[PDB]
C-alpha cells in the first residue's frame, strides 16, 4: 500500500512534534550529528546510518515515505544510533530513552487509526493484507484457530465486506 503523502504527514507529524516538544531531551536530536563541530570523528566508525529529527521531517514534508512503517523504522534508527554511540550513563542516552518512551505512548493509537495492528517495532515477521496492502505483525494478527485459505484479511477490510 502507498498512502497519499499528505495523509501520512497529517497522521504522523503529531508524533514527531511530541518529540520536538521535549525540552531539553530533543535538542541533541534536531540536527544531523556533525562530527567535525562536536569533535568526535569516531561517530562515523560506530554509526553507519545517521538519522535525526530534521531528516525525518524533510521526508514527511517532501513525501518520501510510501507507508508508515518506514517512518517508524527511521525513528528507531535514530534512537538505536544514539543508544549505540553514547554510554548508558550519559545524558544523551537518558534523553534518547525519554524520547522512545514518549514515542511508544503516542504511536500505537496513531498507527491504529491508520488501520494497523499496533505501532511497536517487533520482528521483520510481517503479513500483508490481501485487500488493502497494509503490513501487520504476524504476532499481532495470526492465530492457530484461524485459517485464511485465500490469504490474510485485516479487520478493516473485513468490516467493509
Amino acid at each position: 500500500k502507498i498512502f497519499k503523502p499528505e495523509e501520512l504527514r497529517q497522521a504522523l507529524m503529531p508524533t514527531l512534534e511530541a518529540l520536538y516538544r521535549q525540552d531539553p531531551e530533543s535538542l541533541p536530536f534536531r540536527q544531523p550529528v556533525d562530527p567535525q563541530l562536536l569533535g568526535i570523528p569516531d561517530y562515523f566508525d560506530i554509526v553507519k546510518s545517521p538519522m535525526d529529527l530534521s531528516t525525518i521531517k524533510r521526508k514527511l514534508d517532501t513525501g518520501q515515505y510510501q507507508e508508515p512503517w518506514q517512518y517508524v523504522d527511521d525513528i528507531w534508527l535514530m534512537f538505536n544510533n544514539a543508544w549505540l554511540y553514547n554510554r548508558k550513563t550519559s545524558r544523551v542516552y537518558k534523553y534518547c530513552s525519554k524520547l522512545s518512551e514518549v514515542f511508544e505512548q503516542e504511536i500505537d493509537p496513531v498507527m491504529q487509526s491508520l488501520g494497523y495492528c499496533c505501532g511497536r517495532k517487533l520482528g521483520e515477521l510481517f503479513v500483508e493484507c490481501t485487500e488493502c496492502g497494509r503490513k501487520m505483525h504476524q504476532i499481532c494478527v495470526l492465530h492457530h484457530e484461524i485459517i485464511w485459505p485465500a490469504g490474510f484479511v485485516c479487520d478493516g477490510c473485513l468490516k467493509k465486506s
Binding site: 531539553p24 535538542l27 541533541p28 568526535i40 553514547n86 545524558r91 544523551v92 534523553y95
Partner: peptide, 9 residues
C-alpha cells in the same frame, strides 16, 4: 543540548 562531548548538556 548537543549533549555529546565537545559540547555540554
Amino acid at each position: 543540548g548537543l549533549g555529546k562531548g565537545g559540547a555540554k548538556a
